[PDB]
Amino acid sequence: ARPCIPKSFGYSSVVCVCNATYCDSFDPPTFPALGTFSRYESTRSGRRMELSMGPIQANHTGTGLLLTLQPEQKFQKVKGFGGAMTDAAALNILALSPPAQNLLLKSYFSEEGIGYNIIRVPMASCDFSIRTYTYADTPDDFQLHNFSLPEEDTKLKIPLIHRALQLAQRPVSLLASPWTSPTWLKTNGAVNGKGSLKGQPGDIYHQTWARYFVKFLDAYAEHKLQFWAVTAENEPSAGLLSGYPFQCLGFTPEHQRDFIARDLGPTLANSTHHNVRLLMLDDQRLLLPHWAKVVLTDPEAAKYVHGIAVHWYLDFLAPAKATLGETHRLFPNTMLFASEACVGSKFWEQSVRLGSWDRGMQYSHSIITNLLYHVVGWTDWNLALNPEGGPNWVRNFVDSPIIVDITKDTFYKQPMFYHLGHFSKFIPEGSQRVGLVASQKNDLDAVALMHPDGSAVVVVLNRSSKDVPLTIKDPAVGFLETISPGYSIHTYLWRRQ
Amino acid sequence: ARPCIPKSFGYSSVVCVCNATYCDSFDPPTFPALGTFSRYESTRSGRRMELSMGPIQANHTGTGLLLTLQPEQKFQKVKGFGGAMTDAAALNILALSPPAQNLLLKSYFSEEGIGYNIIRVPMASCDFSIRTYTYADTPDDFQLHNFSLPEEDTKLKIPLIHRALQLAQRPVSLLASPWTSPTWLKTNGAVNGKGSLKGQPGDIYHQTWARYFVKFLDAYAEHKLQFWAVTAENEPSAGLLSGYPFQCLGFTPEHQRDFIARDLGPTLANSTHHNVRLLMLDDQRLLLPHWAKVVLTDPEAAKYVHGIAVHWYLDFLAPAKATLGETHRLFPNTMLFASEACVGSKFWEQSVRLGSWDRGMQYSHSIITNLLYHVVGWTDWNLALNPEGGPNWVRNFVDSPIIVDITKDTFYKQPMFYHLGHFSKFIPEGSQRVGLVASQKNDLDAVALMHPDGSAVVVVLNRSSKDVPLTIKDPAVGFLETISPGYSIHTYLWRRQ
Amino acid sequence: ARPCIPKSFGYSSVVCVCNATYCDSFDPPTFPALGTFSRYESTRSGRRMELSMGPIQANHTGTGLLLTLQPEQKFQKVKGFGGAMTDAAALNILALSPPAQNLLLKSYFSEEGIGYNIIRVPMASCDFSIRTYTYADTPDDFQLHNFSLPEEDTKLKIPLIHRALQLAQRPVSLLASPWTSPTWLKTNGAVNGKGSLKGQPGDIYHQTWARYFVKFLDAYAEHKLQFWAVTAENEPSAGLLSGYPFQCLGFTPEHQRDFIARDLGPTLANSTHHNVRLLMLDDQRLLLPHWAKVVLTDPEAAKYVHGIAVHWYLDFLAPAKATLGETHRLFPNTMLFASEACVGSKFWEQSVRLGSWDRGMQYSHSIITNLLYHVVGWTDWNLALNPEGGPNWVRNFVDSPIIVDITKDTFYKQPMFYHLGHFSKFIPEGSQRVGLVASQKNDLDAVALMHPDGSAVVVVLNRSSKDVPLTIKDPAVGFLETISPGYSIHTYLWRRQ
Amino acid sequence: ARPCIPKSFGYSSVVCVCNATYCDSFDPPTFPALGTFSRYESTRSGRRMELSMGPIQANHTGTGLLLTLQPEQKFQKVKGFGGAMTDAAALNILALSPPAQNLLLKSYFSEEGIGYNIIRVPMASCDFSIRTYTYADTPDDFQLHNFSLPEEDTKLKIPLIHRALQLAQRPVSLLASPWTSPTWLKTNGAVNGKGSLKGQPGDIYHQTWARYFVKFLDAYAEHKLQFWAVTAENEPSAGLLSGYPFQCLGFTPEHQRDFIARDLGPTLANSTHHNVRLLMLDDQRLLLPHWAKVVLTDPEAAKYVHGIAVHWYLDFLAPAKATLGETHRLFPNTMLFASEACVGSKFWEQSVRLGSWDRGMQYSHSIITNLLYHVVGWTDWNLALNPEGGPNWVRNFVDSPIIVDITKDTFYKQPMFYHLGHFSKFIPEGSQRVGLVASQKNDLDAVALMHPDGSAVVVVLNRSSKDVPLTIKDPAVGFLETISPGYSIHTYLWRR
Numbered sequence A, B, C: 001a002r003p004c005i006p007k008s009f010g011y012s013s014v015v016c017v018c019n020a021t022y023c024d025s026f027d028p029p030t031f032p033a034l035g036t037f038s039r040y041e042s043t044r045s046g047r048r049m050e051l052s053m054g055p056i057q058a059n060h061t062g063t064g065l066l067l068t069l070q071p072e073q074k075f076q077k078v079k080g081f082g083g084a085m086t087d088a089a090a091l092n093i094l095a096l097s098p099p100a101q102n103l104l105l106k107s108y109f110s111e112e113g114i115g116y117n118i119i120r121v122p123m124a125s126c127d128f129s130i131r132t133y134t135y136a137d138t139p140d141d142f143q144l145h146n147f148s149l150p151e152e153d154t155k156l157k158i159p160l161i162h163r164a165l166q167l168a169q170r171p172v173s174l175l176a177s178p179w180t181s182p183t184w185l186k187t188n189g190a191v192n193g194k195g196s197l198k199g200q201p202g203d204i205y206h207q208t209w210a211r212y213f214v215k216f217l218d219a220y221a222e223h224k225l226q227f228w229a230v231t232a233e234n235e236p237s238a239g240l241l242s243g244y245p246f247q248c249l250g251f252t253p254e255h256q257r258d259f260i261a262r263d264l265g266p267t268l269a270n271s272t273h274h275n276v277r278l279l280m281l282d283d284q285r286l287l288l289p290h291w292a293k294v295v296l297t298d299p300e301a302a303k304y305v306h307g308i309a310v311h312w313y314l315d316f317l318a319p320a321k322a323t324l325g326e327t328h329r330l331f332p333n334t335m336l337f338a339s340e341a342c343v344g345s346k347f348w349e350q351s352v353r354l355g356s357w358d359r360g361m362q363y364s365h366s367i368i369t370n371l372l373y374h375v376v377g378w379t380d381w382n383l384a385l386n387p388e389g390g391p392n393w394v395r396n397f398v399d400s401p402i403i404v405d406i407t408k409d410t411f412y413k414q415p416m417f418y419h420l421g422h423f424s425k426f427i428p429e430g431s432q433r434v435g436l437v438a439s440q441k442n443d444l445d446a447v448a449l450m451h452p453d454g455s456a457v458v459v460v461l462n463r464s465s466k467d468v469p470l471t472i473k474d475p476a477v478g479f480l481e482t483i484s485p486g487y488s489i490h491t492y493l494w495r496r497q
Numbered sequence D: 001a002r003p004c005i006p007k008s009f010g011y012s013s014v015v016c017v018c019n020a021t022y023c024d025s026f027d028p029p030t031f032p033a034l035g036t037f038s039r040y041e042s043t044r045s046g047r048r049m050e051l052s053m054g055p056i057q058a059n060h061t062g063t064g065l066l067l068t069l070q071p072e073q074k075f076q077k078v079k080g081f082g083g084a085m086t087d088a089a090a091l092n093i094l095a096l097s098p099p100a101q102n103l104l105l106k107s108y109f110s111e112e113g114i115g116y117n118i119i120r121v122p123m124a125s126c127d128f129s130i131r132t133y134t135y136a137d138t139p140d141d142f143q144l145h146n147f148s149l150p151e152e153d154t155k156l157k158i159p160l161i162h163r164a165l166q167l168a169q170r171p172v173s174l175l176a177s178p179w180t181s182p183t184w185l186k187t188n189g190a191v192n193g194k195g196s197l198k199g200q201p202g203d204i205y206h207q208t209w210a211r212y213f214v215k216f217l218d219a220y221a222e223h224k225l226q227f228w229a230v231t232a233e234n235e236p237s238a239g240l241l242s243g244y245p246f247q248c249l250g251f252t253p254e255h256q257r258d259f260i261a262r263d264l265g266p267t268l269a270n271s272t273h274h275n276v277r278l279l280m281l282d283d284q285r286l287l288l289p290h291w292a293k294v295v296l297t298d299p300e301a302a303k304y305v306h307g308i309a310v311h312w313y314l315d316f317l318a319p320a321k322a323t324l325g326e327t328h329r330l331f332p333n334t335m336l337f338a339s340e341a342c343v344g345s346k347f348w349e350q351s352v353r354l355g356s357w358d359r360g361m362q363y364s365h366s367i368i369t370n371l372l373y374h375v376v377g378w379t380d381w382n383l384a385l386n387p388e389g390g391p392n393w394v395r396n397f398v399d400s401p402i403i404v405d406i407t408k409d410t411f412y413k414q415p416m417f418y419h420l421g422h423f424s425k426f427i428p429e430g431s432q433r434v435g436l437v438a439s440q441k442n443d444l445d446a447v448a449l450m451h452p453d454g455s456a457v458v459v460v461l462n463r464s465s466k467d468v469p470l471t472i473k474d475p476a477v478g479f480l481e482t483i484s485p486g487y488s489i490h491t492y493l494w495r496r
């Protein structure tokens, strides 16, 4: 319907400019005829999810690169894709005028945008907040009589989540994660730093903390919001680190195992929110398979754990095969899910690089690798940030797919938005990864899935500078002849019946 | 009750450190016996409103400096003293834990603090806000059907104002001032820059703007808050300047005259808030007496104008005698009131100088000069700021008497707090300035007033480095023998019957 | 010869990219035939001093805008245009490889560039320095035996000035200005802050300071550099301001009058550098005509003062007519000269806005207004800065027409460069402003001059978004039919005989 | 001779204020009589290396904490202590008037100060520079005909190093480290970012880079300065990182091994500067023992490597035992040396915290831990910085033990200065760490050494808030009865 308004800020590619009266958008999804394929293309040179069509040909000759679909090789089913409604994200969105707000929300959540079906919701404050608060800051309130949702939830996050669900055509799943407990439950008596829950699993401290989860779910339920899942703690390894600068709560794998078994599991199961899934880890995949072994070999813990949530920050130390692959081999009925990722947090690098194609490629490369190693979903961090990469009370400024400029009632959609969109828009919940084999060695990253209706989807990422001619073979329908330009990402879709 | 915990940040004096469990405070006011005086002393060296007592002596010999009270020379009556509940101030206060918040509010508003009886409340956003908003941003809403108070008022400012009034023993007067109108009422269609109300006094634009004042008062009344006064516009000269960087609305004196006469006056008088006072100017005293002449010689305007509000920012160009003095001589029944002051806004100077004695002296020197030229009250700007002197969306960072450090649940009371306190605590509403004459030339600044009950109050400021021995003669009671140390401020109190 | 390589950084227009092997440049100046005009055009849309030609027509009909040249209405003669060789500028230039350096110097100083004929040279350190040195820091050296030029002059500034003069086809005039004296000559004993020369005019402190000027001129003369002029002090009002953050030396107008009369004038006149011109003020035009009255009504001072130097920073408070116009009316034989301007120092703006058309328009609007009110030249501040707008030891970062990126051996020519070039390239020394009248009210800014050879030059600036059709009438040659596009600047040239 | 002039800037403790006519200083070292001990004390409350004395007692009774010297348990010998003469440090020192400059240099280098005997010298520009130069920026000069020292070396660094050596009573050792090579030797063609030397070890690129080291040493030798050591590269891991913001040159451990073996080692050994030591790593101790294994198991490399230089920045991820301890166990004849440390680079802290006792304790805790795990020296980063923690061309502003205020001709000596001084002043080169055992579990950090003359030195750091009564037993002389106050550091000295 409406194309990208490009704008360059001196980095490798452009952002797309949106405001109160204009944002780039798609037409309603059309299902093209059998024998034809759809291609969506984004390039470093400036193309943004541009729609073209072509014939699926009966015959193919040549020695070029062939990618062959293997529809009978079936792997994981997809839960979905999305991002995080932090205080910072909510503040930035609400800094826009209402019509601009709606265009931003439509960009993420509607079929005229990229069709997000996951929202991650922090349980109280994190570093992407303007103050340190929990839901129960009144000291020594073990009964949680003074548990309440502050303005951040009731005026910022909750109304935006409602508006997002109203705009979405797909069912949206909410995922909750806590950073810190109330400080009076902690060994160090502070929101940050090295510190765990006081005492031991089973006791009042741990039972109060478990009950805080239920209190959270109750309060959100009173606001007509239900959660698909919760995590046992955001990045539990962080709270084991001396001087950790922002909200954390430390758990060893054993401590998490026992907390799940003795407190969190039973308390959730004995509540009105017993259908809510519990995800473990919510931390770096370097910690796998060890963390999964420790927790899931205890059947008292394992019976409460639906899945394993992973963050991307130490992926460079942790090959996917040895972590994700090995965890799946050992525990094939426990889903693997990517729950957080952002660029810009490395201490030496710039927080926000407006129009960075490299950062887009990091997102799409990560999603592909995750999908090739059994992962069922992928979740961005902050949905929106300001040009500094904030607000953030500890100055841990990072990048986001959408950057909001409050002073100009304007927002910028980065390459990250579109790279994520190449998956989120075209891989609905219940899609299944299928086999895809290359005829020769190549520099492309690619994944193939089948939608619930049987139609095919293939994403092809070219991180090299060289254009790669290629053919996609579907045994049922024929051959898709195409080119993968240098510094491009393509999504291919076609009917198989 | 509790002394100052001093802390130095490398400037000329100390701040007083407060937190969740400790803040410096006074005992309840005792009325000492006839024949004795109370002295409160603050010094650059570290004393903070320290209480001592002494005898009033029958006789006095010597050639030393004599200040002689003239109780029959009567001048203006005092309305009061206070500061501004901006979005920035409210945000900073609410960044503290609740017990720390209460200690801050007690510091300003209780008799255990400095007894503020004025709070200035911006009507919607100013530069000390995190976003630009008015109460009626829905375009062309001349009816003001979509007028509403956002979270800044309902969750931040209003609850804090309630809590302040609960802590105050004296009646607190609220003063409201707008920075900008909705942009659709303005010639330039923006919150900032050179721009006035569209059209002319009498018309729909001006009637809508007048009605916005009533809508504001209604909304605050629904929250159980009544206003003593409103100003016709914050700094109307600012909106006459090309490129003025933050929220403004330009009025010439003629435009303000005609707006008051045709729109604002009648609309207020014909409402349930007809008892609310209207102050004019709310701008630099350099604009007097001209601005007062233009407005108050029109009886159609003059009949609605209770007083003239002045800001201190161009005082260096505008001698008090020729501005305040001359305005009083011409219009003696129209009160002069100081409605805004802050240090740190000069483009070349540091915004926040923690522990600056110089900035304290600027406050007390200004208050004295104002009181010596018919001014009935003096109002600080932001009640609290962060260590950067914000938040502020245009980076117009300035200083404040209280600096809040969110990361340490701590606030710092600056010399400005105490210099203001030397007046606010000891000069209740209805006090009257009286004569005070020096026997010889001196470097001190001094003012004398009488409380409603007839008791005396004298403030003595020494901005020199030399200790000045002095005597205060009251003809009724006798002689107060004392010393004014270098870089000190003293308040003296005594019964006369 | 070589066009602009455009590059966008997200602002309203483009920069032109230069490096070791490429920079945009002009062909040698051609003099087109009588009956034809040359037009050089720069636009927000991307045109950079593009050459076109057209006929001067015999007849003209229509009701459109007519600008009529009045060649017999003669006003001031032009000294020239240029910028400042600060320590920061020199460091940034020398950060490039030698071939890139030469392309930068050629851009400014050659006839293949924009033909600068003025270089302003600070006398020792200012804020655009990496340290706070004077030429005589050895304490109490009233004889100035230890006066010497440090590395900043001998290795950075002086060699670059030589290279600039080698590249220039027009004679280049050097202008010197001091920021601070040695601290041992100052009341405050520091390079910055409120402080003046110790004592009084006539005395040793003032005689030493006067002699420092001669010592400076001697040292530069030993390096084969002669000065056209010196200023009595850079921004003398700055040293009257408490807490002024960088190098300054305070003078009231009286103090400057008496310093010139008693010390600086006589010392210069009695030296080998007696032909060097002395300019007064070197400060904001808001200070005129008062400052000119105070100095020039004393004949003992007036006889040493060739001219009055003005800075642009408070132009928004100081209409040209009432300051520049009035000063000229009173003192028509004392030239007015604009000695410093930069954008980016306002706290609410970015220091550097790469590709800002607005900033270009500020330069050309200022130059036109100055030329329309008797000003004989206009001088930019730093010739080059880094992308942060530095280096600057007090963080007073600002913009510059050329921004150097050290890590890429690249420099960027901003719209400011071209807006300044529209004058500097086409208004040689000795050109004379002549009359130019508009047939009706309009939004254009325009000025007409005559070169020494009698040829005409007209600059037309359009700061509006509307294209303005217009005609220029020269009674001697005929009618130039043209359009002034929105957000454009044009320079028109033609022979009159 | 002259006490600290204290000044508070709102942090946990005071700085000591110095200017053109005043700086705090010590009297000449006295050697007190056998049977007595000297104690130097610094406290958070304001004491700055204050001298007191007491008796060594014949007998001791009680259940209190006993620290027992074990003079026959001998460990590493100490090379020394010091800091870095960066462009930023030099500029800040030279911003002072000459008499103030001399008081600053005396503070660090004289016996009236804290007796530094190491100066680290960057080879051309780093982040603590005002511009991005190398010694050979003329392109493709593989012969290095246009190699030269710019103004930063000849007018700032070299004259200050001369002045420091003149003031020093102990021999001073110079240590050189490069950040980047000329850009025309690099794969990325830039001073910063991800990039290594072009080609492979053995080739012209690597031979030129090796020759640059010799050219550097030659040029400094022409200015009458000799180096004790050089490092193979400052933080070689940095140049492996995409977008690394300042001067770097990337080496894997294999690349460094092969560069040392094929180029740097042979070129140094075949020059007039063959006695100069070569240190490897010059990077985070997290990289050990792996990096040491990779390099030192190749005898072609190992034969050129005198020692291993470590930086402290990732110490929080890298326990000393598993890194320093394990490296020493594997390679006991290869010295471990701490070549760089500074506080203030973490994004969530202030770069400069004037008067921070915490930052002092970080220095002394680090030095003790290093000394307890075989480390032979400890080197601070910038010798002086401005109040912003600069100058620094990429805004990587950090803290320094001395902060110079140019506008007031004043400098501030931080707790870091004194915490470092508690070791540097009292642990001369050739001192040997000896055993020291605690009678019970405690919160103190302590180390014992013996000077070359046989006299004893013990440093005791108390990072807790609790005063700890304690006794030091020397079997030869007797018992030192003392107290370690909360938030204190003590150095004890005695003849044996």
Ligand SMILES: *C(=O)CCCCCCCCC#Cc1ccc2c(c1)C[C@@H](Nc1nc(-c3cccnc3)nc3ccccc13)C2
Pocket (backbone or CB within 6 Å): B241, B242, B243, B244, B245, B347, C235, C237, C238, C284, C313, C314, C316, C342, C345, C346, C347, C398
């Ligand atoms: C801008 O000129 C359009 C009008 C803006 C609307 C009014 C703004 C009010 C609040 C403000 C501000 C502001 C205004 C002007 C300047 C600055 C802040 C910074 C200043 N830069 C500047 N000033 C001086 C100077 C010295 C002594 C006396 N007057 C001015 N000198 C400078 C030297 C070098 C660089 C910047 C300087 C202008």
Ligand SMILES: *[C@@H]1O[C@H](CO)[C@@H](O)[C@H](O)[C@H]1NC(C)=O
Pocket (backbone or CB within 6 Å): C138, C145, C146
């Ligand atoms: C200053 O000049 C004198 C000679 O007049 C000379 O002896 C002295 O060394 C010079 N330099 C300084 C720093 O005093």
